[PDB]
Amino acid sequence: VVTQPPSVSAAPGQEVTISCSGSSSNIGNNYVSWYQHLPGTAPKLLIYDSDKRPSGIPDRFSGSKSGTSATLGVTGLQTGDEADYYCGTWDSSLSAVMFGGGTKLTVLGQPKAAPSVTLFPPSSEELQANKATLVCLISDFYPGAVTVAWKADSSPVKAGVETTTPSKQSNNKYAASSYLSLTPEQWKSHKSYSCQVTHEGSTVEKTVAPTEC
Amino acid sequence: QVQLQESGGGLVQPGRSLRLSCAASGFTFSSYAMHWVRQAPGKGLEWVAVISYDGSNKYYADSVKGRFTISRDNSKNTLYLQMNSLRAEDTAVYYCARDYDWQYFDYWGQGTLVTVSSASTKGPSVFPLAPSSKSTSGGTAALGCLVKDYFPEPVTVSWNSGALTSGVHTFPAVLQSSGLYSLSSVVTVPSSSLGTQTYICNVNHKPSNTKVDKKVEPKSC
Ligand SMILES: CCC(=O)N1CCN(c2ncnc3c(F)c(-c4c(O)cccc4F)c(Cl)cc23)CC1
Ligand code: NA
Ligand code: NA
């Protein structure tokens, strides 16, 4: 319910802001705090009470709140800042803590690169095993953050999707993978399927069809 | 200093139950509310529950309300999370966190991983990801293999018995809703080579002592 942009980036020494957008029951009327998280480690408190810094957090981290939105500002970016950032808050209507969706902060260290997308239809062998997996492989992109969406003909598909977190290739760019697990009957009962990959406000869509090789 | 240590995580079957514990160290435990927070593979942080200093106030995320019970024992400096009726979507690293003044989280544990799957040890099925029929000599082709439905991790993948390493990328595994893992390995090769060079992916699954070699070749299109 509290949303944040998926990705933000800037070069070392530059600055970024990250905002999360809520409603009056949560961000509007409640304490907002911000956390830095590198998965596999423990989240770290950056900002509490919308704009206070704990001891040990440098002044290049700052926060503000305006209406139903809250903003974290980071100046003098350094590579140690590359992490996932979450705002957290209380929702008075639900009586629950809500985290924003998270924003990956990339500190740019190499050229931006739009993804290559390779979409494999189910193999003949897998179909003969009574299964149908579409394999969307996403490669050679940077920053390492993408949003993947699947379409059957032209309608959104959410069931049966699994997507990996981007990780580095040998050439130091990122790759990720997404799977759509279908029934062979679900597969053959549509004119086409599409993997749509959004990267830095730009979208690459690949399409396959049961009737075409 | 203040330290927190979770434990109890591991493999558990759907529908069954599991109890997590969080031991606390460098502070007066009975003066603080305590939270559970979790992170499912590839998802954002998700708050789970909180319990006040004396347990008279507890709150739960809707996604777990009615299935999970948060409790504490202030005489043993321990926080508990009783998880019942476990579902695949409960697979996650679970963290405990100390509350400060009903305002923010200030200290966290290391986490403990919980995997919900009915699966036993099972070797993979390997299917080919054949190169596009639109490949013409003068370009490059992506081919690969889909390693699916194995348990537990890990699988290793090589190509042509280690002879082919340039241009290979093996992806992390996903845990499918079935309780089983899948991953892919892909290699970019010259389209020129597709009618002459054999490409074989070598999949080793040590936990099941299974090795699968799959030949990946162009389709009949
Ligand atoms: C048990 C006493 C009681 O009735 N209440 C009211 C609701 N409730 C809260 N009221 C205001 N802000 C809160 C709040 F900011 C949080 C909170 C926190 O303690 C830590 C991180 C993020 C949060 F939103 C939490 Cl868990 C509860 C809050 C808990 C305190
Ligand atoms: Na990066
Ligand atoms: Na490999």
Author numbering:
A (entry chain A): 18 to 230
B (entry chain B): 1 to 221
Sentences from the paper on this structure:
P1A4 showed similar affinity to all labeled peptides tested in this assay.
To elucidate the structural details of the interaction between P1A4 and ARS1620, we solved a 2.0-Å crystal structure of the P1A4 Fab bound to a reduced, non-electrophilic analogue of ARS1620. With its hydroxyfluorophenyl moiety anchoring deep in the pocket through hydrogen bonding with Asp99 of the heavy chain CDR3, ARS1620 positions its electrophilic acrylamide group towards the solvent, making little to no direct contact with the Fab. We further confirmed P1A4’s specificity for ARS1620 by DSF: P1A4 was stabilized both by an ARS1620-labeled peptide and by free ARS1620, with its melting temperature increasing by 5.6 °C and by 6.2 °C, respectively. Only relatively minor thermal stabilization (3.5 °C) was observed for P1A4 with a peptide labeled with the R atropisomer of ARS1620, confirming P1A4 makes highly specific interactions with ARS1620.
